[PDB]
Design a binder for this molecule. Sequence first.
Ligand SMILES: Cc1cc2nc3c(=O)[nH]c(=O)nc-3n(C[C@H](O)[C@H](O)[C@H](O)COP(=O)(O)O)c2cc1C
Ligand SMILES: Cc1c([N+](=O)[O-])cc([N+](=O)[O-])cc1[N+](=O)[O-]
Length: 349
Amino acid sequence: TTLFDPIKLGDLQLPNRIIMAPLTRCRADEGRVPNALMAEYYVQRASAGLILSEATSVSPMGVGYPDTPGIWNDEQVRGWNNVTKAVHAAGGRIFLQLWHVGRISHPSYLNGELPVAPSAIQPKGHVSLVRPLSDYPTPRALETEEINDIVEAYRSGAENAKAAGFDGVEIHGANGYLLDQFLQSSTNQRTDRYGGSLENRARLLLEVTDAAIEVWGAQRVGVHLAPRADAHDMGDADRAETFTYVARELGKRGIAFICSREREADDSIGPLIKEAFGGPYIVNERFDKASANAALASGKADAVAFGVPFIANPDLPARLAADAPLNEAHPETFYGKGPVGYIDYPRLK
Ligand SMILES: Cc1cc2nc3c(=O)[nH]c(=O)nc-3n(C[C@H](O)[C@H](O)[C@H](O)COP(=O)(O)O)c2cc1C
Ligand SMILES: Cc1c([N+](=O)[O-])cc([N+](=O)[O-])cc1[N+](=O)[O-]
């Protein structure tokens, strides 16, 4: 098996195993509405076996960055429908990544309200993008009832993604955002049904997954994880146990795939997660053609997602096939505004 062999995820046939990683780019129209510029960008990248969209918030309280899209209202649905129709016409496939940032936010995005979290524990560091440099606030710990409200926002978001014509949804369970905050012991000190045991810590992620399953069928739902707990001030007392429990429970549900941001190192727990899960495993983080092909050949992965190389190379799959040079990425325009550093990276000539 190589990167260029087709794979099925659930009942969706992909033409290759080169996956476009979910990538926040901050190019939405005011009101967090997907636009034609975004449609152009995704169309350019439609040769990907599957596109995982930029993280897309399921509610106004789940945003923490400027100009990132939502999926909670009809205006946003209409904007996304233009994106998915264009991707499909270009021969591509796309899942919407469902997001809630939890504590990783700032009151300026929330009309002065505090970000919400399982527990009132301030994340270290400064809010990205916000200027002047600001610390994160201490978040407000959610009431039990409010957590059910959040599950409903994910359910509605999943319904809205289906109306918008996506091929599936991926649950953002990674990178220190809301679901990951509940999952890990350092950030969750709750004593209701949503904290205080592994079963309880994983509960929110699984309730959101089950809601998505009702809308989509599990074989059109994926989950994103960050098992090294290395972004946004995370930390868990037994991550081998935590993430394999999640993997087992997701596998019981027959979900389409797990995609983990976890570069290869001796402490990679990906193999434990893959085995517990039993379904297609998508590795990610610092992979190149050679190491991706090596992981496929060794059975450590079923597909490989590429982030930065897809930012800079719309025709990444053709470039990989040809062992062609790759465009250099410009991190100064990963975020920010407009077409420069977004739709102006060239295709092979
Ligand atoms: C600019 C940028 C935006 C990203 N946005 C997201 C995101 O919205 N959701 C997510 O799960 N990961 C996001 N990531 C992480 C990437 O999906 C990926 O895990 C990371 O870039 C490592 O893979 P790579 O070495 O192939 O780039 C982002 C990364 C970058 C650089
Ligand atoms: C490293 C990282 C993030 N971070 O700053 O800790 C955040 C991401 N995100 O989803 O916004 C993604 C990241 N990543 O995969 O490299």
